[PDB]
Enzyme design. Structure first.
Site, short mmCIF file in Angstrom:
data_model
loop_
_atom_site.label_atom_id
_atom_site.label_comp_id
_atom_site.label_asym_id
_atom_site.label_seq_id
_atom_site.Cartn_x
_atom_site.Cartn_y
_atom_site.Cartn_z
N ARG A 76 -23.05 12.78 -13.69
CA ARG A 76 -21.78 14.53 -12.70
C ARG A 76 -22.97 15.24 -13.20
NH1 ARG A 76 -17.75 10.47 -13.06
NH2 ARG A 76 -15.89 11.76 -11.70
N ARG B 259 -10.19 4.96 -10.92
CA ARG B 259 -9.30 5.60 -10.65
C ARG B 259 -8.50 4.62 -10.70
NH1 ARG B 259 -9.60 2.88 -3.88
NH2 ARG B 259 -7.55 3.51 -3.39
N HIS C 220 -19.11 -8.19 1.74
CA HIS C 220 -17.97 -7.83 1.79
C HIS C 220 -17.21 -8.17 2.30
CE1 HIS C 220 -15.66 -3.93 1.68
NE2 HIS C 220 -15.83 -3.46 2.79
N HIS D 44 -5.04 -11.15 2.86
CA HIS D 44 -4.91 -10.14 3.13
C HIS D 44 -6.00 -10.25 4.17
CE1 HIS D 44 -5.81 -5.29 2.15
NE2 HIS D 44 -6.75 -5.64 3.25
N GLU D 45 -7.78 -10.78 4.37
CA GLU D 45 -8.52 -10.82 5.27
C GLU D 45 -7.37 -11.42 5.75
OE1 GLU D 45 -11.32 -9.00 5.35
OE2 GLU D 45 -10.37 -8.43 3.48
N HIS E 296 -5.01 -9.73 7.95
CA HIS E 296 -5.79 -8.66 9.05
C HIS E 296 -5.25 -8.67 10.03
CE1 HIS E 296 -6.51 -4.49 6.56
NE2 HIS E 296 -6.83 -5.45 5.85
N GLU F 146 -4.27 -1.83 6.17
CA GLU F 146 -4.03 -2.12 4.38
C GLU F 146 -3.00 -2.91 3.39
OE1 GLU F 146 -6.36 -2.56 2.28
OE2 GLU F 146 -7.64 -2.55 3.41
N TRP G 213 -11.07 22.50 -10.10
CA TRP G 213 -10.88 21.05 -10.08
C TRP G 213 -10.33 20.73 -11.06
CZ3 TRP G 213 -10.71 17.26 -7.12
CH2 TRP G 213 -11.03 15.86 -7.54
N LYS H 139 -6.68 19.51 -12.84
CA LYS H 139 -6.59 18.01 -13.09
C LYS H 139 -6.01 18.01 -14.43
CE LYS H 139 -9.60 13.83 -14.26
NZ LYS H 139 -9.11 13.09 -13.59
N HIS I 247 -15.67 8.19 -0.36
CA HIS I 247 -15.21 8.90 0.66
C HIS I 247 -14.84 10.84 0.47
CE1 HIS I 247 -13.36 4.98 1.62
NE2 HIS I 247 -13.21 4.93 -0.04
#
Ligand SMILES: *[C@@H]1O[C@H](CO)[C@@H](O[C@@H]2O[C@H](CO)[C@@H](O)[C@H](O)[C@H]2NC(C)=O)[C@H](O)[C@H]1NC(C)=O
Ligand SMILES: *[C@@H]1O[C@H](CO)[C@@H](O)[C@H](O)[C@H]1NC(C)=O
EC number: 3.4.17.23
Lengths: 246, 596
Positions: free
Chosen positions: B151, B255, B327, B356-357, B360, B384, B459, B463, B487
């Site tokens: 950080r 996450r 990937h 999953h693939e 798709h 997704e 922030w 949080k 992202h």
């Protein structure tokens, strides 16, 4: 190509439709004016062959009462069409790893194509009101585009060879027809025979008279057939009615 | 002069080369990813520049058409994207400065290096290392140092770059008839078509947070439970009324909370869902695993898998000399071409990933009849969600018993199902509040309603209440937590990840509603259920032809976004945790801190 579909005239020969029907390498073979079983039985004056390579998806578009990028501009098929078309996969032949660009299809046409009509014009298509001197601009386009057939193209997109067979019935004598049945010659037995339409029943023996090199069959008096030359070994046979009586 | 008719001709002319060039680019990309070499690197740019320069003249022509009187809804929708020039709204100097700042923001993230103070020459990167230090370990000092280094050495140096990038992106977005930049992102969740199904960006803003208050009892109790169990795991570190630091989450950003499932397992004596011996005993290689999953796909009712996929696709390991990425990707090269690129391994997680693939792949081939500009999901949150629906449906013990994988005399009961549901929830409801607060923070940063001083101090102080994670250490505004994310430097929308799972559950409920299956929702299965396919079939073939508002009508009767299944799927875990947290007071007091 499909906008420049080749036309071949076939006449004065015999057609082997059996080998065409039995072959299992043909992707699409469907037609309704003539059932394929009886096609060899009855024949017409002559036939037209149209060979071109098309995309797999467009194959169903070639049928009576159909409209599409090909069915309306590249080729128009009248609703009263007789005969049908043979389609088969040719991805490994027509396509190349670098992409086959040797086939072109008409995409734009100011007038819809007429049945049994081929248009080879390459006029610069015009859509808008902009004055275009044959040069691309705002809304002035090209009527012809290219195929991009590749081996990695999936089904319905691979180059498929397509041959359209157009059948016509002019008043002139019919030329192309089907094959024979042959069977086998049998003698000394009351049978029936169909020697080139010389239908009749009798017993066939061996004779000794000599035909000139151009007769086909003889007769004696009161117009009754009395001898026939076989169309295979060119020998003079004889005809006798198998006996009858009270 | 008519414009409506010639618009279709322009669309066809654009497409005839658009599909071809996209196919060439996709084939080149697949060639590069399958095998990497110096030759296969420069050709990538040699094709990408041509593809990008193809997108400029088509939009250049898409300004003389007066897109105000075209009556055809399909034509209007198709040319709406045509008028989108892209980055040609600002000056060339500003455009190149923005491109350079994006490139340097990505590269700084790509060159993260933090060394241990004791050994100055021993740095660690995003590869397995310092990330794994606080991922799977029982410590508080090395984790603290690792998080501090991450950080401080990442995000603080990226601060001015993000400062310039935010204002530059906002300015360029304003020139596109947009009040902000976040509105452009919300444009996907926006429709201006049929009345009664219309949607607005502000409607998305309000409806993404009215779908959050219904999970407060489900979350807070869990937090207390985690806190309570943390008390048995880490005594005298956190007050029983306070909240836990970010070090103990298990991830650099917290996450995913499934890393603590084994640590906080209620019944450790009961074995988890293990079929590894079953996979290895009868030699389940990649091909037959994929074939059994394809059999499940067929049992769903999906169309037959296309011939040639087994040939072009490279299922196994790439090899030793032919380097390739691992990937999990499912490529749709176009023109009837489909392939897969994965470093296959015999694991149940890879089983779900393959499911999953292939989901798709099926969804991609569902809308193959669409025009070139409509072969995309109606929103970001369907692809997704569709892929993960198959993953969710493939984990039920019923199907696993149906494929001869579990013992017929198994003893599945409430305890093991509760354990499995806790494992699932730590991944499912373990991401909602942090994702929501991250997206909200990005939104008002884009808007600019908060000044340059209320950016980083806001922030953490928000949080503290949105999630309940205490500030482990004091910090100033020079820090930037959000910038240390995937992202945020590549300008990737993150709102998709919020509704996506919800869609799953909605479908996971709706299909179950049309499944005649009695019992818990987690045990609901769609195997050997043809009726569960056609409902899906009515939407998969839609693609982008119809707005997602009307698309969300053939599966769920309700066209709105109401959070029904989160209170429906996790009913037994919640009703058992209510019994679990009888004495531990739920909620966190935002006053306790490690430093005070
Ligand atoms: C048609 O009939 C037969 C079919 O083969 C051929 O004529 C005979 O052919 C065989 C071998 O093929 C020879 O052994 C005979 O000597 C042939 N006989 C005659 C009379 O030709 C030939 O293909 C054709 N014959 C005719 C007369 O058209
Ligand atoms: C799918 O295609 C394969 C390959 O021919 C065939 O064996 C299988 O029976 C087909 N299944 C269905 C459901 O069409």
């Amino acid at each position: 190509s499909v906008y420049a579909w080749n036309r071949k005239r076939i006449s004065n020969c015999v057609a082997d439709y059996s080998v065409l029907y039995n072959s299992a390498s043909f992707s699409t073979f469907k037609c309704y004016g003539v059932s394929p079983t009886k096609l060899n039985d009855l024949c017409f004056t002559n036939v037209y062959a149209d060979s071109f390579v098309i995309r797999g998806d467009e194959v169903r578009q070639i049928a009576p009462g159909q409209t599409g990028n090909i069915a309306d501009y590249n080729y128009k098929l009248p609703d009263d069409f007789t005969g049908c078309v043979i389609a088969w996969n040719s991805n490994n032949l027509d396509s190349k790893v670098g992409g086959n660009y040797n086939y072109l299809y008409r995409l734009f046409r100011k007038s819809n194509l007429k049945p049994f009509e081929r248009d080879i014009s390459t006029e610069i298509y015009q859509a808008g009101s902009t004055p275009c001197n044959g040069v691309k601009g705002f809304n002035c386009y090209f009527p012809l585009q290219s195929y991009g057939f590749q081996p990695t193209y999936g089904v319905g997109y691979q180059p498929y060879r397509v041959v359209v067979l157009s059948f016509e019935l002019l008043h002139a004598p019919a030329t192309v027809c089907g094959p024979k049945k042959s069977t086998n010659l049998v003698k000394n037995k009351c049978v029936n025979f169909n020697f080139n339409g010389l239908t009749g029943t009798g017993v066939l023996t061996e004779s000794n008279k000599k035909f000139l090199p151009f007769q086909q069959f003889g007769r004696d008096i009161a117009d009754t057939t009395d001898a026939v030359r076989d169309p295979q070994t060119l020998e003079i046979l004889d005809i006798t009615p198998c006996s009858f009586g009270g | 002069s008519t414009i409506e008719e010639q618009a279709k001709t322009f669309l066809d002319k654009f497409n005839h080369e658009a599909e071809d060039l996209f196919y060439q680019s996709s084939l080149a990309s697949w060639n590069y990813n399958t095998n990497i070499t110096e030759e296969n690197v420069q050709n990538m740019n040699n094709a990408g520049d041509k593809w990008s320069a193809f997108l400029k003249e088509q939009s250049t022509l898409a300004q003389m058409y007066p897109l105000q009187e075209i009556q055809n809804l399909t034509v209007k929708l198709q040319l709406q994207a045509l008028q989108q020039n892209g980055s040609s709204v600002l000056s060339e100097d500003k455009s190149k400065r923005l491109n350079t700042i994006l490139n340097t923001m990505s590269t700084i993230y790509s060159t993260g290096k933090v060394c241990n103070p004791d050994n100055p020459q021993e740095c660690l990167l995003l590869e397995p290392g310092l990330n794994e230090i606080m991922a799977n370990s029982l410590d508080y000092n090395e984790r603290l140092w690792a998080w501090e280094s991450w950080r401080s050495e990442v995000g603080k140096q990226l601060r001015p770059l993000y400062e310039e990038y935010v204002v530059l992106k906002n300015e360029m977005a304003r020139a596109n008839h947009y009040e902000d930049y976040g509105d452009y992102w919300r444009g996907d969740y926006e429709v201006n078509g049929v009345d009664g199904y219309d949607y607005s960006r502000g409607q998305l803003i309000e409806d993404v947070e009215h779908t959050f208050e219904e999970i407060k009892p489900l979350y807070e109790h869990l937090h207390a439970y985690v806190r309570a169990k943390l008390m048995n795991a880490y005594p005298s570190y956190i007050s029983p009324i306070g909240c836990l630091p970010a070090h103990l989450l298990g991830d650099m950003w917290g996450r995913f909370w499934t890393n603590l499932y084994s640590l906080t397992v209620p019944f450790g004596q009961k074995p988890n869902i293990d079929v590894t011996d079953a996979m290895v005993d009868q030699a389940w290689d990649a091909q037959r695993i994929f074939k059994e999953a394809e059999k499940f796909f067929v049992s769903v009712g999906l169309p037959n898998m296309t011939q040639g996929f087994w040939e072009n696709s490279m299922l196994t390991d790439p090899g030793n000399v032919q380097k390739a990425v691992c990937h999990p990707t499912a490529w749709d090269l176009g023109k009837g071409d489909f392939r897969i690129l994965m470093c296959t391994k015999v694991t149940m997680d890879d089983f779900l990933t393959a499911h999953h693939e292939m989901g798709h792949i099926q969804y991609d081939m569902a809308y193959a009849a669409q025009p070139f500009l409509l072969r995309n999901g109606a929103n970001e949150g369907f692809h997704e969600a569709v892929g993960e629906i198959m993953s969710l449906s493939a984990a039920t013990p019923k199907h696993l018993k149906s494929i001869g994988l579990l013992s017929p005399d198994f003893q599945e009961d409430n305890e093991t199902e509760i354990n499995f549901l806790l494992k699932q929830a730590l991944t499912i409801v373990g991401t909602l509040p942090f994702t929501y607060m991250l997206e909200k923070w990005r939104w008002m940063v884009f808007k600019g309603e908060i000044p340059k001083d209320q950016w980083m101090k806001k922030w953490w102080e928000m949080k503290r209440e949105i999630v309940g994670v205490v500030e482990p250490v004091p910090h100033d505004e020079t820090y930037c937590d959000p910038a240390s994310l995937f992202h945020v430097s590549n300008d990737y929308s993150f709102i998709r990840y919020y509704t996506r799972t919800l869609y799953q559950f909605q479908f996971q409920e709706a299909l179950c509603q049309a499944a005649k299956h009695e019992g818990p929702l987690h045990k609901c299965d769609i195997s050997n259920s043809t009726e569960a396919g056609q409902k899906l079939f009515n939407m998969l073939r839609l693609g982008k032809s119809e707005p997602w508002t009307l698309a969300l009508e053939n599966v769920v009767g309700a066209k709105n976004m109401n959070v029904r299944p989160l209170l429906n799927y996790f009913e037994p875990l919640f009703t058992w945790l209510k019994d679990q947290n009888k004495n531990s007071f739920v909620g966190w007091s935002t006053d306790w801190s490690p430093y005070a």
